[PDB]
Amino acid sequence: PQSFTSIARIGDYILKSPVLSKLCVPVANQFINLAGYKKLGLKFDDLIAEENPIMQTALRRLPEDESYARAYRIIRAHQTELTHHLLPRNEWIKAQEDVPYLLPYILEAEAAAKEKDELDNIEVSK
Amino acid sequence: PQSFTSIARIGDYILKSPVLSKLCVPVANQFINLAGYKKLGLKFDDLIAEENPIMQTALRRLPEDESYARAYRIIRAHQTELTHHLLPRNEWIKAQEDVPYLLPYILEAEAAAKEKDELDNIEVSK
Amino acid sequence: KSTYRTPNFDDVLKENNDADKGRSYAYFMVGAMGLLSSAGAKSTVETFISSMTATADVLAMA
Amino acid sequence: KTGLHFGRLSLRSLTAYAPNLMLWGGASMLGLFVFTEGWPKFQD
Amino acid sequence: VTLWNVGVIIFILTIATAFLGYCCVYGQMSHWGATVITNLFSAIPFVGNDIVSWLWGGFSVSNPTIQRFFALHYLVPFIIAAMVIMHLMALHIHGSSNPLGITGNLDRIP
Amino acid sequence: SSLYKTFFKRNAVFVGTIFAGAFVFQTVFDTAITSWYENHNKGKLWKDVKARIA
Amino acid sequence: MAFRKSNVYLSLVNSYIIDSPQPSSINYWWNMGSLLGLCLVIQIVTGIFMAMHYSSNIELAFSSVEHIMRDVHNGYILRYLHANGASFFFMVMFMHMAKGLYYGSYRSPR
Amino acid sequence: AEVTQLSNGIVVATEHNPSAHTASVGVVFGSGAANENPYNNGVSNLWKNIFLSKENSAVAAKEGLALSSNISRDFQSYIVSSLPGSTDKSLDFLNQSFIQQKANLLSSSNFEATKKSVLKQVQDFEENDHPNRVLEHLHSTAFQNTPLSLPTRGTLESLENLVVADLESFANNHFLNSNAVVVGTGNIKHEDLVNSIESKNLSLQTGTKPVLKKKAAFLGSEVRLRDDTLPKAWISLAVEGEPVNSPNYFVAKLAAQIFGSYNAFEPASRLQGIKLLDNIQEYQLCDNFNHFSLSYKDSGLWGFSTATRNVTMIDDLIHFTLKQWNRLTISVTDTEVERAKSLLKLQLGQLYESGNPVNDANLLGAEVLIKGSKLSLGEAFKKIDAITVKDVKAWAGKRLWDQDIAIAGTGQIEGLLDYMRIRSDMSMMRW
Numbered sequence A, B: 001p002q003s004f005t006s007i008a009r010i011g012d013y014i015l016k017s018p019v020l021s022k023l024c025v026p027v028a029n030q031f032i033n034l035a036g037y038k039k040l041g042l043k044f045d046d047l048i049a050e051e052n053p054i055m056q057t058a059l060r061r062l063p064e065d066e067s068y069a070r071a072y073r074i075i076r077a078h079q080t081e082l083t084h085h086l087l088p089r090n091e092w093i094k095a096q097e098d099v100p101y102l103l104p105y106i107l108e109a110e111a112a113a114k115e116k117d118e119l120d121n122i123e124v125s126k
Numbered sequence C: 001k002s003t004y005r006t007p008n009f010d011d012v013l014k015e016n017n018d019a020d021k022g023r024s025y026a027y028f029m030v031g032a033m034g035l036l037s038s039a040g041a042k043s044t045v046e047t048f049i050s051s052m053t054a055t056a057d058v059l060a061m062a
Numbered sequence D: 001k002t003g004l005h006f007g008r009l010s011l012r013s014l015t016a017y018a019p020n021l022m023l024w025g026g027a028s029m030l031g032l033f034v035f036t037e038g039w040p041k042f043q044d
Numbered sequence E: 001v002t003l004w005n006v007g008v009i010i011f012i013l014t015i016a017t018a019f020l021g022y023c024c025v026y027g028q029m030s031h032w033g034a035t036v037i038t039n040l041f042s043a044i045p046f047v048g049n050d051i052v053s054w055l056w057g058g059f060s061v062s063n064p065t066i067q068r069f070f071a072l073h074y075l076v077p078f079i080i081a082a083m084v085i086m087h088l089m090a091l092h093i094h095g096s097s098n099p100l101g102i103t104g105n106l107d108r109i110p
Numbered sequence F: 001s002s003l004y005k006t007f008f009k010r011n012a013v014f015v016g017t018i019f020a021g022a023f024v025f026q027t028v029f030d031t032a033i034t035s036w037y038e039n040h041n042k043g044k045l046w047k048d049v050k051a052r053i054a
Numbered sequence G: 001m002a003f004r005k006s007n008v009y010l011s012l013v014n015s016y017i018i019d020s021p022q023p024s025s026i027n028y029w030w031n032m033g034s035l036l037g038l039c040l041v042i043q044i045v046t047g048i049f050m051a052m053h054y055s056s057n058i059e060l061a062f063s064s065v066e067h068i069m070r071d072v073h074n075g076y077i078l079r080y081l082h083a084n085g086a087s088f089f090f091m092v093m094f095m096h097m098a099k100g101l102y103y104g105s106y107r108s109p110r
Numbered sequence H: 001a002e003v004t005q006l007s008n009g010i011v012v013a014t015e016h017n018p019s020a021h022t023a024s025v026g027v028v029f030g031s032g033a034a035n036e037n038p039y040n041n042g043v044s045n046l047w048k049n050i051f052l053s054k055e056n057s058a059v060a061a062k063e064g065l066a067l068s069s070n071i072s073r074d075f076q077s078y079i080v081s082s083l084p085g086s087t088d089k090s091l092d093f094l095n096q097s098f099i100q101q102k103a104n105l106l107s108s109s110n111f112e113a114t115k116k117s118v119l120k121q122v123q124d125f126e127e128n129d130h131p132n133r134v135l136e137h138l139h140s141t142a143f144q145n146t147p148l149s150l151p152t153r154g155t156l157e158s159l160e161n162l163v164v165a166d167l168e169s170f171a172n173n174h175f176l177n178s179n180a181v182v183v184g185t186g187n188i189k190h191e192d193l194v195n196s197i198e199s200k201n202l203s204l205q206t207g208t209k210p211v212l213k214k215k216a217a218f219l220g221s222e223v224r225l226r227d228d229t230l231p232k233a234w235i236s237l238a239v240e241g242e243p244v245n246s247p248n249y250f251v252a253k254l255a256a257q258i259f260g261s262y263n264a265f266e267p268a269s270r271l272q273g274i275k276l277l278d279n280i281q282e283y284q285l286c287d288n289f290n291h292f293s294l295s296y297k298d299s300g301l302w303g304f305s306t307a308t309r310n311v312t313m314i315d316d317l318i319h320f321t322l323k324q325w326n327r328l329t330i331s332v333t334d335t336e337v338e339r340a341k342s343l344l345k346l347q348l349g350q351l352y353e354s355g356n357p358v359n360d361a362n363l364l365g366a367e368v369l370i371k372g373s374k375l376s377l378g379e380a381f382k383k384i385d386a387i388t389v390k391d392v393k394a395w396a397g398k399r400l401w402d403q404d405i406a407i408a409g410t411g412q413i414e415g416l417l418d419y420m421r422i423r424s425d426m427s428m429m430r431w
């Protein structure tokens, strides 16, 4: 899959540009509301697939208090979905709470894997 | 299989009796020489099958020095047999060395299993 | 007895080990066994596959 | 400087085996002549 | 990924089975359906007209074709069953997914 | 000798040489056995009887 | 670890064929079980290639087997191999069973 | 930084260093543990300890003199150290107590007391020092029935039947002027040492040491010393290598430096540029390893030693290590060679430029006894910088690819597989 380093490179270019941000941001906001993961009580970083080594590394480096809350949001959402209901509207994730809490741990583990890999296939001068 | 308690009960009766011992012992000695386990460097108690709980118990209670020697006699005999040779005649087990070194540990573990097992099916008086 | 004394192996050892030669004879035999069994495998497969071709009575009415 | 590696199979990994690939690209040329000779299919 | 690939194999072997069985009825859709599909292999370069005559056992869809298609049609179901066992072995490693697309190790039911 | 890194070592051409020799062996082995058989049974075959009934 | 130990399918081949611990002293009588496995492959393969030419009707059956002998290319090889292969399969099985009876392989834990 | 040799019938070598604070003077002989037989094995180890006993070290301490000695397979040493303006007293002690009079040292009381301590040293070594006794066992299976098989400390059985006559016989046969080198290191000038010697006369014995009937020969084999009560497995494995005074001497040292040494518990040792480490660290199959290239007068060894607590994955450790060796014939890169060049220079640059004059004397005397001359460190560097990838591949194709091996192990080695499954890993079968 696509790297979060590449996702951030494209996104930052779109956001720094005034004309593109005024044209692509409203589309992205209503793509978020139509998806409907907040209505089950989840933040976006709960949805990222975790069966790969870069993502297993990021979850160990996470603090204990943020890790206990993530486990509860995931259990609550499974139970909400087997009953085929939604949560009460006063328990929906708000926009100001949908923060990228795990992205810095991911970008740090990715940058180290690229540095290690370049060093294992170096062309040396004389 | 037959219990060593029963084997010892029959044997002791034969041995205490003078007429039966003079009639059944020479047959038993030449049954031993024709078998040929001494020619591979084994005592008889090396041959007893060990895949049962009474026999696993007896081997734990065995001293360390007698247990290291048993392991060597068994390895030496496997190697002698894959080459299809016999050992030198000065390395054969002699009669005075073919002692029942493991029988007391077996009879002790058997007597305890019978006592436990009678106590679990007792008929009580009033 | 010490463990640094190696036992007697003089019944089974060679002229001089001569690694140019000890590898020669073992790998000629391993090569011959692979040559014959690859030819045999190829005759077995072609015998089974040719049985699916037209029979004698079908070729007579050809 | 670092030669780009495509994950596992690097540019130096493909050049130290290219002669080997030509001889395993022969190893089935040589299996092919034993594969079908025996029902008519001639090489050229 | 390994579980998806063994499944693609089962699908191919299942189209083959059904095709062979419809030909064994030997009605009028059976004869002309086998003619159209088996004549496709006569276009392979330099080797095609040898493959059709070995598939037919002759010069057309005939008796040798119908007797070999029934014996193969009995066989392939037992090969599908052996691929179904290998399919289940690859599921036992990671287990099943779920409709949300996140981990299921926090809440499991026997 | 140095047969090693031309005959033994290079397994790429070993398996190659195993197969390449398998095809050549079959052709000459066939021709040799069919000549010995047809000569051991000389005077019985059809191609010889056919000549005698001229 | 090695791929032969990590892969789901090769791990079973390794544990049964490659790294399996065997006693140092087993003799050639322990080789009969391997042969019975080649026997079963010989019979199944030879039989499927004959079933392509066999007819089971009571009025057609004897003459189908004589047709495999005379008209089928290498059909006399398939039948005689197959017919004599069953006599060999039974002889190796009697020796396999007589061995286990001699060496006590029936006893617990087996 | 240059050594100066003269000859008078007595060879005299010297590496003067004006900026040091001590001086070492001694005599080195060209006979070691590979110059004795299975009956008198350990007679040299007992000669060292007679030199270092009490009443001889007391007599030196009253004058301000320290003593040292070393036994190896090709040579022995007997060294005296002092302050720089006390070197003539060092030579006198070396003359009196060692070369001329020794009836004082071989007395009946000093001999028994020395034998008791040496037997306790050797018994302790065989019960507690596991990595070093497995390497000694490797030498004894690789070179069996040859002189390079005998252990340097001696064996507890042969060491018990020694008497003073065995010492005196060995002295008369090997402590000879034809088999000797007089050394001097630290703050000592060559002319002063030469002048002090000719003022005396200073000769031990004449010469004619015995010639050794058998030459050293390598044999592929194994020896297993199984002990299930110890908590680890210790293993060493090698092939035949290069002797001293070979053209491939530095190329074999560079090849050992490519795979290097490892400690799992040190953080910086886990980050080395060694491709073998990408395979072991994911399941942690070992605690440490080290690659060696040992060289003698007649033969050598090239290989590695390891210790591990993961006793169920030994076969993965041996397998992955031997597959990396195969790459020296087929696919070694230029970066791996330029790394090993500069780390080899740092290695032997620290061995030959330490601050201890005792180590200098042992190195100098051993090299001059074989070559007649010492190769400087500026010359050895130029030979190392001239090695190419082609030289490595040519060396490995001759010494490593499909060649016999020697193996030794002790401890929990149930998981160490048979000889022929390890021997088969010396070629790839994918080339």
Ligand SMILES: CCCCCCCCCCC(=O)OC[C@H](COP(=O)(O)OC[C@H](O)COP(=O)(O)OC[C@@H](COC(=O)CC)OC(=O)CCC)OC(=O)CCCCCCCC
Pocket: B084, G027, G028, G029, G088, G091, G092
């Ligand atoms: C139908 C065809 C099926 C094909 C295979 C059938 C094989 C079944 C034979 C029965 C059997 O498996 O046991 C045979 C047993 C010897 O087994 P062992 O391990 O104790 O001795 C290993 C040997 O010393 C070293 O033999 P080595 O490995 O050194 O050389 C190989 C030997 C080949 O022998 C074989 O193939 C064994 C079958 O090379 C030669 O013989 C050179 C002459 C060309 O011999 C006996 O104990 C008594 C044998 C007579 C009774 C046989 C009656 C059976 C009906």
Ligand SMILES: CCCCCCCCCCCCCCCCCC(=O)OC[C@H](COP(=O)(O)OCCN)OC(=O)CCCCCCCCCCCCC
Pocket: B081, G029, G094, G095, G097, G098, G099, G102
């Ligand atoms: C429904 C099921 C019923 C089945 C009934 C089974 C009958 C089938 C007949 C098969 C014949 C095979 C007989 C041999 C049995 C195999 C096991 C065996 O005999 O052991 C081999 C034994 C080895 O010698 P050792 O006693 O020294 O032990 C090994 C060393 N540690 O050495 C021996 O014991 C001697 C070996 C010689 C074998 C040949 C003797 C028989 C010859 C004619 C048999 C004719 C059969 C057609």
Ligand code: HEM
Pocket: E003, E004, E007, E008, E010, E011, E084, E087, E091, E095, E096, E097, E098
């Ligand atoms: C005879 C044919 C098949 C049988 C008996 C079979 C059986 C099963 C069973 C019992 C499961 C358990 C979970 C579930 O039911 O979803 C499963 C899962 C699965 N099967 Fe099959 N299957 C067959 C064909 C296929 C085919 C043709 C494909 C794809 C081309 C496939 C791909 C999968 C996948 C990807 C899963 C896992 C789905 C998940 O866990 O989300 N299978 N199969």
Ligand code: HEM
Pocket: G040, G043, G044, G047, G048, G049, G050, G051, G054, G065, G079, G082, G083, G086, G089
């Ligand atoms: C354990 C495997 C098998 C055994 C032991 C076995 C045994 C036999 C035997 C004893 C015969 C009679 C031989 C004779 O002609 O005198 C026979 C005939 C036959 N068998 Fe099998 N069989 C096996 C498997 C199969 C299979 C799987 C097939 C079909 C796919 C098959 C197809 C036939 C046919 C068509 C005949 C007809 C007569 C002939 O061709 O000889 N067999 N079989």
Ligand SMILES: COc1c(O)c(C)c(C/C=C(\C)CC/C=C(\C)CC/C=C(/C)CC/C=C(/C)CC/C=C(\C)CCC=C(C)C)c(O)c1OC
Pocket: E072, E079, G016, G017, G033, G034, G035, G036, G037, G038, G040, G041, G042, G044, G045, G048
């Ligand atoms: C002790 O250790 C051992 C061991 O010693 C041995 C010997 C074995 C080896 C094997 C056995 C003992 C027996 C196992 C054998 C089977 C399960 C046999 C399965 C048999 C078959 C015949 C499968 C055949 C399938 C086919 C598709 C072929 C049939 C027809 C074809 C190809 C015709 C169609 C062709 C065309 C062109 C249309 C072990 O596995 C083993 O591990 C325990």
Ligand SMILES: CCCCCCCCCCCCCCC(=O)OCCCOP(=O)(O)OC[C@@H](O)COP(=O)(O)OCCCOC(C)=O
Pocket: E085, E086, E088, E089, G012, G013, G016, G017
């Ligand atoms: C290098 C030299 C090689 C030369 C020799 C050539 C021979 C090559 C072939 C070797 C033979 C193959 C190896 C043997 C093997 O893998 O299988 C035999 C072992 C027993 O099979 P199993 O995989 O344990 O059973 C298979 C099982 O482990 C798996 O169970 P599963 O089916 O997933 O459960 C589903 C059941 C659910 O129950 C139901 C259906 O309700």
Ligand SMILES: CCCCCCCCCCCCCCC(=O)O[C@H](COC(=O)CCCCCCCCCCCC)COP(=O)(O)O
Pocket: C027, C030, C031, C033, C034, C037, F011, F014, G017, G034, H429
């Ligand atoms: C469990 C059943 C036991 C019996 C299994 C018998 C199956 C045969 C497989 C043998 C494979 C040997 C491993 C290859 C190897 O190590 O490197 C091979 C060595 O072996 C060979 O060359 C092939 C020798 C024999 C031909 C193999 C087919 C035998 C006939 C099959 C008959 C049907 C059963 C490569 O050669 P090299 O190592 O010198 O480079």
Ligand SMILES: CCCCCCCCCCCCCCCCCC(=O)O[C@H](COC(=O)CCCCCC)COP(=O)(O)OCCN
Pocket: E001, E002, E005, E006, E082, E083, E085, E086, E093, G006, G007, G008, G009, G010, G012, G013
């Ligand atoms: C079914 C009979 C019952 C007994 C069980 C049968 C077991 C014997 C199987 C014989 C061995 C088959 C060789 C498999 C080759 C390696 C497979 C592989 O590369 O795994 C996959 C790729 O496989 C595929 O895409 C489809 C394989 C279909 C094979 C159909 C024969 C490699 O992926 P990976 O590196 O993650 O290894 C798996 C780790 N569990």
Ligand SMILES: CCCCCCCCCCCCCC(=O)O[C@H](COC(=O)CCCCCCCCCCC)COP(=O)(O)O
Pocket: C037, C039, C040, C041, C042, C043, C044, C047, G042, G045, G077
């Ligand atoms: C699977 C069947 C194996 C049965 C073996 C029993 C012995 C009878 C052999 C009958 C074989 C029929 C073919 C023939 O006649 O060829 C004959 C050649 O003989 C051989 O090479 C023996 C073949 C057996 C060697 C082992 C092969 C390993 C199995 C391969 C599976 C991939 C004649 O064929 P031809 O047309 O002349 O080239």
